[PDB]
């Protein structure tokens, strides 16, 4: 499948795996119809994938600016600059 079809299938799986209201007996009949009904191990892997997938008016709104970012010919990022 192409990239847009794979993204749409991933969005459909994310919408049908998390918003199914914890229903596992009825979600397999739709996932097997959308995938082609290979085996139960694919549905068991998809269930685990769905489980692992999911200046204001305040005076203090502006945080106090305490002196920091210590300046120094030392490269904190630790990368030899080459401009």
């Amino acid at each position: 499948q192409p990239r847009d079809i794979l993204c749409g299938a991933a969005d459909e799986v994310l919408a049908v795996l998390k918003n199914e209201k914890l229903r596992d007996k009825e979600r397999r009949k739709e996932i097997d119809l959308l995938l082609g009904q290979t085996d139960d191990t694919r549905y068991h892997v998809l269930v685990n994938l769905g489980k692992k997938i999911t200046i204001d008016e305040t005076y203090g709104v502006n945080v106090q600016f305490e002196s920091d970012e210590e300046e120094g010919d030392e490269d904190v990022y630790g990368e030899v600059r080459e401009e």
């Binding site: 300046e71 120094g72 010919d73 030392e74 490269d75 630790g78 990368e79 030899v80 600059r81 401009e83």
Partner: peptide
Amino acid sequence: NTLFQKDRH
């Protein structure tokens, strides 16, 4: 040793 210094620029 200072080839990676910040003030090099």
